[PDB]
Scaffold this active site. Structure first.
Site, mmCIF file in Angstrom:
data_model
loop_
_atom_site.group_PDB
_atom_site.id
_atom_site.type_symbol
_atom_site.label_atom_id
_atom_site.label_comp_id
_atom_site.label_asym_id
_atom_site.label_seq_id
_atom_site.Cartn_x
_atom_site.Cartn_y
_atom_site.Cartn_z
ATOM 1 N N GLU A 11 0.769 -1.210 0.000
ATOM 2 C CA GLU A 11 0.000 0.000 0.000
ATOM 3 C C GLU A 11 0.806 1.269 0.000
ATOM 4 O O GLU A 11 0.268 2.268 -0.413
ATOM 5 C CB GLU A 11 -0.932 0.064 1.235
ATOM 6 C CG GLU A 11 -1.987 -0.999 1.162
ATOM 7 C CD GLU A 11 -2.925 -0.838 -0.029
ATOM 8 O OE1 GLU A 11 -3.062 0.127 -0.744
ATOM 9 O OE2 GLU A 11 -3.705 -1.834 -0.216
ATOM 10 N N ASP A 20 -6.168 6.617 -5.224
ATOM 11 C CA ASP A 20 -5.698 5.274 -5.306
ATOM 12 C C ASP A 20 -5.698 4.802 -6.792
ATOM 13 O O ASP A 20 -5.983 5.582 -7.695
ATOM 14 C CB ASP A 20 -6.476 4.361 -4.342
ATOM 15 C CG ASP A 20 -7.844 4.015 -4.876
ATOM 16 O OD1 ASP A 20 -8.308 4.439 -5.918
ATOM 17 O OD2 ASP A 20 -8.521 3.176 -4.121
ATOM 18 N N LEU A 32 -9.018 4.088 2.415
ATOM 19 C CA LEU A 32 -9.935 4.707 1.495
ATOM 20 C C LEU A 32 -10.851 5.718 2.204
ATOM 21 O O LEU A 32 -11.383 5.468 3.283
ATOM 22 C CB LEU A 32 -10.744 3.634 0.748
ATOM 23 C CG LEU A 32 -11.938 4.247 -0.054
ATOM 24 C CD1 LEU A 32 -11.488 4.925 -1.335
ATOM 25 C CD2 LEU A 32 -12.911 3.151 -0.396
ATOM 26 N N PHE A 104 -8.540 -6.542 2.622
ATOM 27 C CA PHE A 104 -8.175 -5.160 2.855
ATOM 28 C C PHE A 104 -8.297 -4.378 1.565
ATOM 29 O O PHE A 104 -8.856 -3.308 1.499
ATOM 30 C CB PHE A 104 -6.708 -5.128 3.333
ATOM 31 C CG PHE A 104 -6.197 -3.722 3.802
ATOM 32 C CD1 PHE A 104 -5.692 -2.815 2.873
ATOM 33 C CD2 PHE A 104 -6.190 -3.347 5.151
ATOM 34 C CE1 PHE A 104 -5.188 -1.562 3.249
ATOM 35 C CE2 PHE A 104 -5.681 -2.112 5.555
ATOM 36 C CZ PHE A 104 -5.189 -1.221 4.603
ATOM 37 N N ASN A 132 -6.718 -20.060 -10.874
ATOM 38 C CA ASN A 132 -8.070 -19.486 -10.902
ATOM 39 C C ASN A 132 -8.054 -18.064 -10.364
ATOM 40 O O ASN A 132 -8.800 -17.210 -10.783
ATOM 41 C CB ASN A 132 -8.997 -20.347 -10.006
ATOM 42 C CG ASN A 132 -10.431 -19.940 -10.112
ATOM 43 O OD1 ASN A 132 -10.966 -19.119 -9.325
ATOM 44 N ND2 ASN A 132 -11.093 -20.442 -11.150
#
Ligand SMILES: [Ar]
Ligand SMILES: [Cl-]
Ligand SMILES: [Cl-]
Length: 162
Positions: A11, A20, A32, A104, A132
């Site tokens: 981050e 972001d 956020l 997160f 996947n």
């Protein structure tokens, strides 16, 4: 390594409001603030979060505080989600950090929609799960990060972060 150092790497740390990867107002360690296009709105949500008039800027301690609350909230979210908890409880410690990273970033909601991947992880079919997991908008939009998390679920080690 641990969940905090891991997310601090993915981050970054910014002490002024920034946008972001999706263009949403954020601050600190991936905190956020709002999906709204309004900077004012973002400043208001920051002030409310910190408890003072910040004028769009925070200190290191404050960012770290938001971070701790956010990680805790993420874990708690997992333990409360009926689709997530069982998976999470079946994993080893390293892999659990991977699951937290995803929650997160994309929310409980978002992660709970990776149905097939979740079942593969629950079955300990690492390589299949990793393939996947990569078939997702998440991987195509933030490929470097997704690769680190994916390798983490695949191997059960922190090699991607070393
Ligand atoms: Ar999970
Ligand atoms: Cl908050
Ligand atoms: Cl990335």
């Amino acid at each position: 390594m641990n969940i905090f150092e891991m997310l601090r790497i993915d981050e970054g740390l910014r002490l002024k409001i920034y946008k972001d990867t999706e263009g949403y107002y954020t601050i600190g360690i991936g905190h956020l603030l709002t999906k709204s296009p309004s900077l004012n709105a973002a400043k208001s949500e920051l002030d409310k979060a910190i408890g003072r008039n910040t004028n769009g800027v925070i200190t290191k301690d404050e960012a770290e505080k938001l971070f701790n609350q956010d990680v805790d909230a993420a874990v708690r979210g997992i333990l409360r989600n009926a689709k997530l908890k069982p998976v999470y409880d079946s994993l080893d410690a390293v892999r659990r950090a991977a699951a937290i990273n995803m929650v997160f970033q994309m929310g409980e909601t978002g992660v709970a929609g990776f149905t097939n991947s979740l079942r593969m992880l629950q079955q300990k079919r690492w390589d299949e799960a990793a393939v996947n997991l990569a078939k997702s908008r998440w991987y195509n939009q933030t490929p470097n990060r997704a690769k680190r998390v994916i390798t983490t679920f695949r191997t059960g080690t922190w090699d991607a972060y070393k």
